């Protein structure tokens, strides 16, 4: 309640108290590099048709 | 149903015994008290939202 003075009673509040600190980044166990050759570093490309 | 009766100008009906009847009247009074956290519903756990 956006004020510096509060009247007597019971009120409902937001969280305002806990925030995360750490991080979990678990991804699969692959490691082989994708074949950017023969797609970018290739000898011949086909016709558009 | 129809119970047509015409008229009379010298007759009167008197009831000779009675019955005590107990009836039930059903009336709502109050409804459930519900509160909403606007930020949690709209945005959840995102700071940008
Ligand atoms: C009007 O009075 C008569 C009696 O004069 C009632 O008939 C009696 O009903 C009760 C039960 O409620 C019995 O125990 C009695 O035995 C009955 N009569 C007698 C004295 O034998 C009648 O029920 C009363 N009015 C209404 C329509 O309830
Ligand atoms: C009503 O009452 C009067 C009294 O004089 C009588 O003449 C008349 O016939 C009555 N009519 C009915 C509705 O019976």
Answer yes or no: do B35 and A12 touch at CB < 8 A.
Answer: yes
Going by C-alpha positions, the residue among B34, B37, B46 that lies closest to residue A15 is B37
The separation between CA A13 and the C-alpha centre of its own chain, rounded to angstroms, equals 28
Q: To what resolution in angstroms was this structure determined?
A: 2.8
DSSP code at position A38: T
Residue of A nearest to B39 (CA): A14
Residue of B nearest to A15 (CA): B40
CA dist., res. A15 & res. B45, Å (int): 11
CA dist., res. A41 & res. B6, Å (int): 110
Going by C-alpha positions, the residue among A41, A14, A22, A27 that lies closest to residue B37 is A14
Strand, coil or helix: B41: helix
> Technique behind this structure?
cryo-EM
């Amino acid at each position: 309640t956006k004020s510096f003075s509060v009247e007597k009673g019971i009120y409902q509040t937001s969280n305002f108290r806990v925030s995360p600190s750490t991080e979990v980044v678990r991804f699969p166990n692959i490691t082989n590099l994708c074949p950017f050759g023969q797609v970018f570093n290739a000898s011949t490309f086909p016709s558009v048709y | 149903e129809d119970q047509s009766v015409a008229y009379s100008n010298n007759s009167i009906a008197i009831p000779t015994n009675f019955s005590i009847s107990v009836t039930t009247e059903v009336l709502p009074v109050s409804m459930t008290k519900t509160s909403v956290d606007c930020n949690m519903y709209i945005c959840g756990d995102s700071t940008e939202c």
